[PDB]
Amino acid sequence: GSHMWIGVISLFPEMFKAITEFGVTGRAVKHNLLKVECWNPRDFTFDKHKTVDDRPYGGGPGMLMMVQPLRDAIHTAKAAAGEGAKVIYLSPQGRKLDQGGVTELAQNQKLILVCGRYEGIDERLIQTEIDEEWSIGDYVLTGGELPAMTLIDAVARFIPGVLGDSFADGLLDCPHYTRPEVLEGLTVPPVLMSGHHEEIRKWRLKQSLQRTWLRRPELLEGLALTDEQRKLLKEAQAEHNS
Amino acid sequence: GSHMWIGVISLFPEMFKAITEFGVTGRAVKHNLLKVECWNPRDFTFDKHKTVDDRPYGGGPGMLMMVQPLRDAIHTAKAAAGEGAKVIYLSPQGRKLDQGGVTELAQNQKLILVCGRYEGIDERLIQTEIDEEWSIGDYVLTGGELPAMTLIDAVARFIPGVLGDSFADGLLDCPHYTRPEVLEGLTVPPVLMSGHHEEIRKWRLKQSLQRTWLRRPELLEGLALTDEQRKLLKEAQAEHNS
Numbered sequence A, B: 001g002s003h004m005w006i007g008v009i010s011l012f013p014e015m016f017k018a019i020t021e022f023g024v025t026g027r028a029v030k031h032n033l034l035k036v037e038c039w040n041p042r043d044f045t046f047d048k049h050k051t052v053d054d055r056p057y058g059g060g061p062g063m064l065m066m067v068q069p070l071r072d073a074i075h076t077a078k079a080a081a082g083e084g085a086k087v088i089y090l091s092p093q094g095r096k097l098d099q100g101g102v103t104e105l106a107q108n109q110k111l112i113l114v115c116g117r118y119e120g121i122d123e124r125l126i127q128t129e130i131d132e133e134w135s136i137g138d139y140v141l142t143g144g145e146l147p148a149m150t151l152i153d154a155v156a157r158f159i160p161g162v163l164g165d166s167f168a169d170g171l172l173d174c175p176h177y178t179r180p181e182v183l184e185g186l187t188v189p190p191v192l193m194s195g196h197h198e199e200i201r202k203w204r205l206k207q208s209l210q211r212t213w214l215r216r217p218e219l220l221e222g223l224a225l226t227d228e229q230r231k232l233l234k235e236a237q238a239e240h241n242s
């Protein structure tokens, strides 16, 4: 349908089994809603020791991805993708990922995700081969693989058929409760047992607004609250001030 | 040494092979710098079909983690951990992870990471079993496993012996270059070929400052720049204004 093809360039393709073999994403792959195809720069080496790293000009303690095997792997993935694939490099220097950015990236039918290791890749490859540079958050990991998997999982959720959000309207989720009715002395809010669908809807919305206000008030300033939301937030804030 | 033990509660323990079997984190596990131990709530079920999800009070289209198997798995992990383990729940409602938060979490010798699936876990379990709620970014994934792996990888980097940052001083990284000297017409900055260590250090620092200013200027307002940094940033900005 709105099938997504994702090409991955990675020195550790087997890490991606974590998303292709399990859960909701594993089902998406099995049902051909999502295709994940990996190229390993190690396969594009020609020396005896299959060297995939190289020394940075100017010195320093770190290494970089070696250009030739990585470049060749990228070119091979682009040829497989055909026309219209967006090439993305995951790094801490990239555009910060959030749900709006996920929905933007999900519009692409084809993506190629380049996973850097060591201290990343040559700046000129970013200039010549990469379309967009993205970050999954302001922290440093040992490789771009977990960020690529994170991105794949987040965009997969927008593929029709993959799933069987309060974040959609920009708020944190309300609390949820399941059995038992009492758990270490803590009871389920009676409204959720009432069967009153409208009261339940409004309770949940009010809780989301109150939680967003208390935990992440900057998220609220980015929203144009509806009439109903302005009301429930005012109520939640008044109850908080007792 | 500063060994880290991380207990994981997950319906898909095999996803964690992505960090325990490969790369720098895989080496940390093999060398006993990092221990990752998983408990699967499915193993704590008692019904024939090993049910691990349950219906939310109040209705709605989603499911929650079933309380009893998850609670029992958590209790088992806590007993294994002994004293002083911090229990962390990964969710979009949690404290946003950044490098400072990683360095804080890395101070813990023991962590227990609870991975939610479906629409997450019962709010009362958060109250009774969870010490801290963390998010790896403002986006929604199909489970807490990739966020837990992300957290594990980020904190592992602070374990002595695991690695063989410009982010440390709060800036984006400078560009890096490796062979060849010319790549699709693009040359390496001559300073990096000069062998002049101090000029190279200052170039890199100036590039980091310029890149942080252009891409993420809000990161700069959070810093108390050194004298040297104030100077190189002014220079970079003047060159940008030509």
Ligand SMILES: NC(=O)c1ccc(NCc2cccc(O)c2)nc1
Residues within 6 Å of the ligand: A090, A091, A092, A116, A117, A118, A119, A120, A121, A134, A135, A136, A137, A138, A139, A140, A141, A142, A143, A144, A147, B173
């Ligand atoms: N925040 C992220 O999206 C993210 C991405 C990659 C990564 N590590 C690989 C890498 C890649 C580039 C430069 C570099 O120094 C290290 N760590 C975190």
Ligand SMILES: NC(=O)c1ccc(NCc2cccc(O)c2)nc1
Residues within 6 Å of the ligand: A173, B090, B091, B092, B116, B117, B118, B119, B120, B121, B134, B135, B136, B137, B138, B139, B140, B141, B142, B143, B144, B147
């Ligand atoms: N941003 C994160 O750290 C993150 C964490 C978990 C997650 N999904 C599992 C889950 C857990 C809780 C509620 C819920 O609705 C879904 N997705 C993203």
